[PDB]
Amino acid sequence: EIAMEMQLTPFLILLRKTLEQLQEKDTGNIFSEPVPLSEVPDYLDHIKKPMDFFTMKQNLEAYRYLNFDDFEEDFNLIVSNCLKYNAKDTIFYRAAVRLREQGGAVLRQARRQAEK
Numbered sequence: 001e002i003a004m005e006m007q008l009t010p011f012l013i014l015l016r017k018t019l020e021q022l023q024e025k026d027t028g029n030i031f032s033e034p035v036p037l038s039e040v041p042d043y044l045d046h047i048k049k050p051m052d053f054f055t056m057k058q059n060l061e062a063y064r065y066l067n068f069d070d071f072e073e074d075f076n077l078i079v080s081n082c083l084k085y086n087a088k089d090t091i092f093y094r095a096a097v098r099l100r101e102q103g104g105a106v107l108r109q110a111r112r113q114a115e116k
């Protein structure tokens with residue numbers, strides 16, 4: 001399977017499935033819409049690039065993820081943003097740790113498929 005020959009549609013089908021699997025791990029509904037700046041007024045004082053699963057879905061369908069690195073980078077922002085903004089004694093921090101853990105095998109297996 002050679003990179004210049006790779007078709008977009010199959011790759012996007014793979015990313016759609018992978019994103020569904022990742023988002024399903026958000027059983028607390030913490031990561032599935034943007035952190036609202038109106039309700040968390042200091043959020044952008046700390047976080048340079050917010051990310052969430054709905055924004056990832058929009059990016060996917062707008063053809064913004066054309067390799068696995070860029071996709072995984074945004075999933076990793078969901079986690080890292082949360083670990084920075086929230087203290088390690090909070091439920092939200094631990095929820096990000098759990099999301100990273102559960103996302104791990106999903107992403108590794110998905111990348112292996114993307115590399116054929």
Ligand SMILES: CCN(C(=O)c1ccccc1OC)c1cc2c(cc1N1CCNC[C@H]1C)n(C)c(=O)n2C
Pocket residue numbers: 029030031033034035036039040081082085086092
């Ligand atoms: C701003 C929403 N939020 C809350 O914790 C919250 C605040 C006020 C009133 C109700 C609320 O939720 C019930 C929130 C903050 C987050 C946050 C997520 C949320 N909410 C929790 C409720 N579901 C939506 C989600 C965006 N993440 C990932 C963060 O890093 N921070 C700081």
